[PDB]
Amino acid sequence: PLIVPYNLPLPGGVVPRMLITILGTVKPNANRIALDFQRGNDVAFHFNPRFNENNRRVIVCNTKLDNNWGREERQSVFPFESGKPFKIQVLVEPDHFKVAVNDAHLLQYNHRVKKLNEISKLGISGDIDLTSASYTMI
Numbered sequence: 001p002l003i004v005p006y007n008l009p010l011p012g013g014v015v016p017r018m019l020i021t022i023l024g025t026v027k028p029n030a031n032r033i034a035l036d037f038q039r040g041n042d043v044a045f046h047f048n049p050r051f052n053e054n055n056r057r058v059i060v061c062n063t064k065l066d067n068n069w070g071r072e073e074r075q076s077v078f079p080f081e082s083g084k085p086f087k088i089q090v091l092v093e094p095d096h097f098k099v100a101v102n103d104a105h106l107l108q109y110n111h112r113v114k115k116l117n118e119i120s121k122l123g124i125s126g127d128i129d130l131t132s133a134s135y136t137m138i
């Protein structure tokens, strides 16, 4: 497995048609996972599965600018399962990140950070065994 937290450079930033694939296994009794598409210190897109928020499971998405979090977008559809292998695919589209988990569409996140070519790192953290992190163009 790979080290966690893991930093995946995204050379020259992201661009529409870029596909990022994360393979991993959720730890048993996991509490949280996070993917962070970063533009310097800013987080353009924070994708944050929470396994126990008030005994509910929820995915929280947000953007961090100048060290401040913005308005959260929440998705109650929750495809992750403690102890089980997953695939997260993030397709960059002109106006949003499109996220699918285990080949099922999950959510879209409108670009708040609009300088896409400056979003040049993906951080992966939380309660997973990380198997692979890669990107390609489709």
Ligand SMILES: OC[C@H]1O[C@@H](S[C@@H]2O[C@H](CO)[C@H](O)[C@H](n3cc(-c4cccc(F)c4)nn3)[C@H]2O)[C@H](O)[C@@H](O)[C@H]1O
Pocket: 032, 033, 034, 046, 048, 060, 061, 062, 069, 070, 072, 125, 126, 127
């Ligand atoms: O400040 C008050 C608010 O707190 C947040 S909680 C906060 O949410 C942020 C996204 O918006 C990040 O997820 C942040 N976060 C999460 C992580 C993190 C770090 C490691 C692993 C891993 F999965 C996640 N780092 N920072 C988290 O602390 C509540 O959602 C909101 O309702 C309100 O109470």
